[PDB]
Design a protein around this nucleic acid. Structure first.
Ligand SMILES: [Mg+2]
Length: 208
RNA sequence: AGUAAAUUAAGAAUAGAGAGCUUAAUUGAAUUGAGCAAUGAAGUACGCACACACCGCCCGUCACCCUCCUCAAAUUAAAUUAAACUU
């Protein structure tokens, strides 16, 4: 890295800086005073104070990008969100007043609740004990649990789709199916959890 | 980490000749542990009949030639003795 270890990650929260001084906890108040005598990293090209920037969706975009084609990957995510909004508007208009209440037309809220439905609480680590490969039930961190949900989505759509279907049409159809706990990405989570019960007694081999 | 990946340009050398090489630029990620059971290294302790240094040293059965010794059925071979007393 070209940043020395003494550099601090930038804080790009607009409201945080403009809060009244008394509203800030003394711990936060102390850090701000310390940061005045430190070096701050430059903000990333994609780090902005925009009110429409969601870290979860921005991360999902980077996991789809191939060869640094951010314009294409962002376009694919923009087309997906729109394909989900247009799919719920059609259902909402073609539904009764009672049914209309339940229907969710926010694509950003369908994406977050979809991913969370696919996240697995426990995973598996492959281990070779006595020249035999065993996978031991592991408890997954918040970072490993989130990564696996996004990875499983980007892999079901990339591979298990018809040749002429497009990613905005497969991903939209999968975010909505996961949003209802019916999709194949949810089935992957159910299989992972079910296998952990099979290897329930083999967690002892853990050394880490 | 401006890394990987992807995409460009130029240069060396040639008369010409690389999908090779050198260099410059662009776009631009994911991830980094509740680590040491193992693998390797380092440190400490201990062991060593190894020092060619464990790809070490090393012990028995088995296999030819040669040296010495022992036992043993028998056979024969030479060797080796000592006196006893009568009249
Ligand atoms: Mg040439």
């Amino acid at each position: 890295s070209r940043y020395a270890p003494e550099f601090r990650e930038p804080l790009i929260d607009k409201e945080y800086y403009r809060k009244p001084v008394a509203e800030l906890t003394e711990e936060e108040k102390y850090d701000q005073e310390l940061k005045k005598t430190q070096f701050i990293k430059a903000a990333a090209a994609t780090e902005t104070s925009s009110v429409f920037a969601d870290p979860v969706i921005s991360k999902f975009t980077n996991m789809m990008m191939k060869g640094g084609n951010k314009v294409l990957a962002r376009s694919l995510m923009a087309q997906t969100l729109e394909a989900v909004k247009r799919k719920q508007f059609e259902k909402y208009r073609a539904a009764s007043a009672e049914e209309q209440a339940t229907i969710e037309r926010n694509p950003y809220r369908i994406f977050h609740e979809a991913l969370k439905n696919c996240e697995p609480v426990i995973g598996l680590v492959p281990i070779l004990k006595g020249g035999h490969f065993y996978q031991v039930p592991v408890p997954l961190a918040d970072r490993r649990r989130r990564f696996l949900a996004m990875k499983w989505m980007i892999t079901e759509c990339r591979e298990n789709k018809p040749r002429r279907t497009l990613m905005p049409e497969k991903l939209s159809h999968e975010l909505l199916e996961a949003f209802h706990n019916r999709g194949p990405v949810i089935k992957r989570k159910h299989n992972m959890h079910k296998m952990a019960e099979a290897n329930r007694a083999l967690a002892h081999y853990r050394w880490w």
